[PDB]
């Protein structure tokens, strides 16, 4: 039937009936659960996704059955019948983008879902125009450190025509320069994208925190290279509140977390270039970006600066170092007046969100393994909260790298 | 290419495929519509097919699959179920299935040790006094004065039209939880119910934070009887911190032996309702869950205050700091007292090795990511970065309803 969802800290029980409105399969079956996998392994179709979304939309503005509702359904119906596709009204698009964020099972920032600035960029016809749009998104979202959630939406995909794409996974990323002695200077996650940029004519640096250029691709054209104006890219030097040697490590991170390679699906329409940004949760930088073994991997360095017993695991040097690194990030962002949220405040707001959604929709799709932060899991309330995972539409999806 | 789940390690870039999951006979809670992977609690013909499957597992494991002894044992079991409705396991079959149930347990991070398990056959036990004796023997052997040893004691199987053997307590060692007149709980809140049950059954209760509970043991079709463990059998470790000298003054302690006693051990359709097993602790079980869960001892605020942290703002990471020191204290104290313990780094490293071993041996390993990843320092350990497939294999350990 419907999943009984229990919170083990409070003894409380909800029933998820929102999951019944899932029209898309996930990776699991009764025989085996694949919930920990990061990636996923005619015109009547399109028409029904379209009607469904238009229905959601008119329900959202409390105008179901009305004249504008009926008329909008026929517009969509007439357009698909004749051209095999259709187009969204700006207001529908705004609604759709907001629902997509709201439906995102991995996002711990969804308390904010109704407060999203949506830029319509569907009147874009060149890489160069994409660059102008992207720069404005960055300026707006960054806002001198008082970060604001934004999405910019580029022209949808069209049958038998290449996609608009941003090649970079994030609008802001540090280069990863593969040294021929195996090692990597900079961010190992970005070795491939850095190499692509160089091949398309970028003059490379030799630092650990070199901001990449963007490769933008207008349909069926080679990607073009655009160096972002340094004044648009706000960064925070990292220093520790009590450990005065920490700043000497020469660490920094950018302020704007903007995903640029995910696909946005609304009403059966697909937007292959639709970068979005909010603000960082501190553990994203402090734990994953700086401490992941296959990223900057600074745990041992900091642990030695703290004069810790690296010899054995049981001294918990790793854990001690990690906490200070995360503390340094929160302190540094706070000192620079750049918006940040720690994992405790984050998960506390997420619980409140689960509650809002239970009353609003009868449930909330959430991915436990992603919502629970990378350190201090059970210290946060989400750890103790059962969650149901499923795919609702509108939705953000992964898509292949365009190369 | 391959028609089996693809499994990736994101730290190392390595790919595997799980073919073992194909052997799964029991469905879990998930469907294509929704993932319920994070939920904690999600006929002779029937028996025969389960039994045949197990005897096949057994003969495969001794490499006599297809043999005469194999086909004979099958006929023996089929003929035994024929005249009685049940069958019985040979001793070494019981040992194999006990070890295979542990090896199959998706939630257990200690499975590297699965081959080294002492199996105490107690299928001759006929009273509650006898259960207590066997349990005491288990505690003595498993504890081994601090040099801990994996063990399980198997009591008689469920029998048609006859009451189960049951240990009412969830563990062999558990602290009491006394509900106060002011609504609070003294001791361990996890154990309020079992505590009140012990009292109802005649236990004279203490009033400490760390009172060991008596066992409520139940022989077929009999009321449970109460048994107090002799204190010298129950090894405890006082908790101190290696540098913070005041930590020892908190008066915190924990027992050495983690022994689960309310789980049902299923082998070839046969159900062993009382089959307590024990290993040694992974340090975060004590330091993070037992000592810091809000609904357990909840000492995080206490420790933080002592460390002089700013408990008024989340962004001080005072929870994170205190939690680290509490885990360090758990480790340091067990080490100092020479009681076996494994930290969450060492444990996960060893579990990675287990996965590699099982990949070669069985072509996969069922594993519950939410339960394998530790409750602090998640992405600091390698299993965080390891994708896992979860499914039910048999023989298996299973949750069972509480006897009352
Ligand atoms: C406003 C502050 C926000 C915070 C604090 C936040 C937090 C997070 C975090 C921690 C993750 C996990 C990502 C990872 O660790 O790789 C995530 C993922 C995600 N977020 Fe946000 N988020 C915010 C805003 C937004 C916005 C504005 C959108 C889109 C409109 C969004 C959509 C998503 C999606 C689709 C994912 C999944 C990404 C993936 O599967 O790789 N979030 N969020
Ligand atoms: C040898 C050292 C062992 C270690 C370090 C270990 C570690 C763990 C840990 C950390 C858990 C998670 C439980 C929780 O967080 O509440 C667990 C669960 C489990 N273990 Fe072990 N274990 C060990 C031995 C054993 C043995 C000997 C058996 C059985 C013969 C066993 C069977 C299980 C089962 C069935 C679970 C799942 C419990 C549940 O779902 O409630 N383990 N183990
Ligand atoms: F190679 C890969 C294949 C699949 C997933 C992967 C990691 C996922 C991309 C990361 N998911 C988003 C990470 C991120 C970065 C910056 N900002 C945000 N962000 C912004 C708002 N909400 C999240 N997310 C790598
Ligand atoms: F109220 C509840 C309902 C369902 C599950 C829950 C937590 C699971 C009991 C805990 N799982 C066993 C915990 C445990 C304790 C002591 N030792 C061991 N142990 C020993 C060897 N391997 C594990 N596990 C509470
Ligand atoms: C294998 C595992 O599922 C994978 O590493 C996941 C776990 N949870 C995560 N959670 C967040 N927030 N971000 C991640 O990249 C991941 N990775
Ligand atoms: C809701 C969630 O599934 C629950 O809190 C789980 C998460 N992971 C766990 N992991 C372990 N090892 N032990 C547990 O009791 C739990 N509890
Ligand atoms: Zn699942």
Tab-separated table of N, CA and C in Angstrom, chain B residues 328-389:
chain	number	residue	atom	x	y	z
B	328	UNK	N	36.584	9.280	21.228
B	328	UNK	CA	37.979	9.080	21.592
B	328	UNK	C	38.057	8.432	22.967
B	329	UNK	N	37.195	8.881	23.883
B	329	UNK	CA	37.173	8.326	25.230
B	329	UNK	C	36.749	6.863	25.219
B	330	UNK	N	35.778	6.518	24.374
B	330	UNK	CA	35.359	5.121	24.286
B	330	UNK	C	36.546	4.262	23.873
B	331	UNK	N	37.252	4.713	22.837
B	331	UNK	CA	38.398	3.981	22.317
B	331	UNK	C	39.514	3.865	23.339
B	332	UNK	N	39.902	4.998	23.899
B	332	UNK	CA	41.003	5.033	24.840
B	332	UNK	C	40.742	4.154	26.068
B	333	UNK	N	39.502	4.143	26.543
B	333	UNK	CA	39.195	3.379	27.742
B	333	UNK	C	39.190	1.866	27.491
B	334	UNK	N	38.665	1.433	26.346
B	334	UNK	CA	38.671	0.006	26.006
B	334	UNK	C	40.100	-0.500	25.805
B	335	UNK	N	40.919	0.320	25.151
B	335	UNK	CA	42.333	0.018	24.960
B	335	UNK	C	43.052	-0.133	26.292
B	336	UNK	N	42.845	0.839	27.172
B	336	UNK	CA	43.480	0.873	28.482
B	336	UNK	C	43.093	-0.324	29.333
B	337	UNK	N	41.856	-0.777	29.181
B	337	UNK	CA	41.357	-1.924	29.923
B	337	UNK	C	41.572	-3.239	29.180
B	338	UNK	N	42.301	-3.198	28.059
B	338	UNK	CA	42.536	-4.386	27.213
B	338	UNK	C	41.249	-5.145	26.844
B	339	UNK	N	40.207	-4.416	26.486
B	339	UNK	CA	38.976	-5.023	26.034
B	339	UNK	C	38.928	-4.752	24.549
B	340	UNK	N	38.598	-5.772	23.769
B	340	UNK	CA	38.631	-5.663	22.320
B	340	UNK	C	37.660	-4.590	21.856
B	341	UNK	N	38.101	-3.785	20.898
B	341	UNK	CA	37.246	-2.776	20.283
B	341	UNK	C	37.824	-2.358	18.934
B	342	UNK	N	36.943	-1.998	18.009
B	342	UNK	CA	37.393	-1.474	16.727
B	342	UNK	C	36.797	-0.089	16.420
B	343	UNK	N	37.668	0.846	16.073
B	343	UNK	CA	37.220	2.179	15.682
B	343	UNK	C	36.587	2.135	14.300
B	344	UNK	N	35.862	3.195	13.950
B	344	UNK	CA	35.105	3.215	12.692
B	344	UNK	C	35.973	3.315	11.441
B	345	UNK	N	37.205	3.775	11.581
B	345	UNK	CA	38.106	3.753	10.434
B	345	UNK	C	38.579	2.325	10.169
B	346	UNK	N	39.143	1.695	11.195
B	346	UNK	CA	39.670	0.343	11.066
B	346	UNK	C	38.576	-0.600	10.608
B	347	UNK	N	37.397	-0.466	11.207
B	347	UNK	CA	36.250	-1.299	10.845
B	347	UNK	C	35.858	-1.190	9.364
B	348	UNK	N	35.696	0.034	8.874
B	348	UNK	CA	35.296	0.207	7.488
B	348	UNK	C	36.383	-0.243	6.519
B	349	UNK	N	37.646	0.097	6.786
B	349	UNK	CA	38.742	-0.441	5.988
B	349	UNK	C	38.618	-1.960	5.877
B	350	UNK	N	38.414	-2.633	7.006
B	350	UNK	CA	38.354	-4.087	6.982
B	350	UNK	C	37.116	-4.576	6.219
B	351	UNK	N	36.055	-3.778	6.236
B	351	UNK	CA	34.836	-4.169	5.540
B	351	UNK	C	35.019	-4.016	4.033
B	352	UNK	N	35.827	-3.039	3.622
B	352	UNK	CA	36.163	-2.904	2.207
B	352	UNK	C	36.845	-4.177	1.728
B	353	UNK	N	37.800	-4.657	2.522
B	353	UNK	CA	38.493	-5.909	2.251
B	353	UNK	C	37.501	-7.068	2.124
B	354	UNK	N	36.539	-7.112	3.041
B	354	UNK	CA	35.493	-8.121	2.998
B	354	UNK	C	34.752	-8.115	1.650
B	355	UNK	N	34.394	-6.917	1.173
B	355	UNK	CA	33.678	-6.750	-0.092
B	355	UNK	C	34.471	-7.327	-1.266
B	356	UNK	N	35.755	-6.991	-1.316
B	356	UNK	CA	36.675	-7.543	-2.297
B	356	UNK	C	36.760	-9.071	-2.213
B	357	UNK	N	36.842	-9.611	-0.997
B	357	UNK	CA	36.865	-11.061	-0.797
B	357	UNK	C	35.615	-11.731	-1.354
B	358	UNK	N	34.466	-11.147	-1.037
B	358	UNK	CA	33.180	-11.735	-1.387
B	358	UNK	C	32.880	-11.575	-2.876
B	359	UNK	N	33.393	-10.495	-3.454
B	359	UNK	CA	33.311	-10.280	-4.881
B	359	UNK	C	33.923	-11.492	-5.583
B	360	UNK	N	35.111	-11.898	-5.154
B	360	UNK	CA	35.729	-13.092	-5.722
B	360	UNK	C	34.979	-14.387	-5.364
B	361	UNK	N	34.567	-14.539	-4.103
B	361	UNK	CA	33.972	-15.801	-3.620
B	361	UNK	C	32.547	-16.061	-4.092
B	362	UNK	N	31.723	-15.014	-4.131
B	362	UNK	CA	30.293	-15.178	-4.412
B	362	UNK	C	29.776	-14.248	-5.495
B	363	UNK	N	30.628	-13.335	-5.953
B	363	UNK	CA	30.264	-12.394	-6.994
B	363	UNK	C	29.393	-11.268	-6.476
B	364	UNK	N	29.607	-10.861	-5.226
B	364	UNK	CA	28.860	-9.759	-4.655
B	364	UNK	C	28.689	-9.900	-3.157
B	365	UNK	N	28.226	-8.835	-2.503
B	365	UNK	CA	27.951	-8.869	-1.065
B	365	UNK	C	26.808	-7.924	-0.669
B	366	UNK	N	25.688	-8.495	-0.199
B	366	UNK	CA	24.545	-7.673	0.210
B	366	UNK	C	24.931	-6.760	1.373
B	367	UNK	N	24.635	-5.478	1.238
B	367	UNK	CA	25.092	-4.499	2.208
B	367	UNK	C	24.141	-3.305	2.249
B	368	UNK	N	23.886	-2.830	3.462
B	368	UNK	CA	22.928	-1.766	3.734
B	368	UNK	C	23.733	-0.493	3.994
B	369	UNK	N	23.893	0.315	2.954
B	369	UNK	CA	24.722	1.516	3.017
B	369	UNK	C	24.442	2.404	4.258
B	370	UNK	N	23.165	2.681	4.536
B	370	UNK	CA	22.802	3.543	5.664
B	370	UNK	C	23.334	2.994	6.986
B	371	UNK	N	23.372	1.669	7.106
B	371	UNK	CA	23.840	1.014	8.334
B	371	UNK	C	25.344	0.726	8.359
B	372	UNK	N	25.989	0.688	7.192
B	372	UNK	CA	27.407	0.347	7.131
B	372	UNK	C	28.257	1.589	7.356
B	373	UNK	N	27.852	2.695	6.734
B	373	UNK	CA	28.455	3.999	6.986
B	373	UNK	C	28.251	4.420	8.449
B	374	UNK	N	29.337	4.816	9.139
B	374	UNK	CA	29.267	5.137	10.567
B	374	UNK	C	28.508	6.450	10.835
B	375	UNK	N	28.011	6.620	12.070
B	375	UNK	CA	27.189	7.794	12.400
B	375	UNK	C	27.973	9.109	12.602
B	376	UNK	N	29.296	9.054	12.765
B	376	UNK	CA	30.121	10.259	12.641
B	376	UNK	C	31.178	10.006	11.560
B	377	UNK	N	31.686	11.078	10.951
B	377	UNK	CA	32.808	11.002	10.009
B	377	UNK	C	32.551	10.135	8.779
B	378	UNK	N	31.288	10.031	8.389
B	378	UNK	CA	30.863	9.327	7.192
B	378	UNK	C	31.807	9.297	6.004
B	379	UNK	N	31.984	10.429	5.330
B	379	UNK	CA	32.785	10.446	4.101
B	379	UNK	C	34.290	10.417	4.378
B	380	UNK	N	34.650	10.365	5.659
B	380	UNK	CA	36.044	10.184	6.036
B	380	UNK	C	36.449	8.701	5.960
B	381	UNK	N	35.460	7.807	5.953
B	381	UNK	CA	35.700	6.365	5.847
B	381	UNK	C	35.435	5.905	4.409
B	382	UNK	N	36.112	4.834	3.962
B	382	UNK	CA	36.024	4.458	2.536
B	382	UNK	C	34.658	3.924	2.062
B	383	UNK	N	33.890	3.286	2.945
B	383	UNK	CA	32.599	2.701	2.552
B	383	UNK	C	31.562	3.745	2.112
B	384	UNK	N	31.750	4.990	2.546
B	384	UNK	CA	30.863	6.067	2.139
B	384	UNK	C	30.901	6.163	0.611
B	385	UNK	N	32.094	5.994	0.049
B	385	UNK	CA	32.329	6.197	-1.374
B	385	UNK	C	32.083	4.941	-2.191
B	386	UNK	N	31.601	3.901	-1.511
B	386	UNK	CA	31.353	2.597	-2.119
B	386	UNK	C	29.857	2.342	-2.303
B	387	UNK	N	29.423	2.187	-3.554
B	387	UNK	CA	28.037	1.803	-3.820
B	387	UNK	C	27.784	0.381	-3.326
B	388	UNK	N	26.561	0.127	-2.872
B	388	UNK	CA	26.211	-1.168	-2.318
B	388	UNK	C	24.841	-1.600	-2.785
B	389	UNK	N	24.693	-2.901	-2.999
B	389	UNK	CA	23.425	-3.508	-3.354
B	389	UNK	C	22.881	-4.219	-2.121
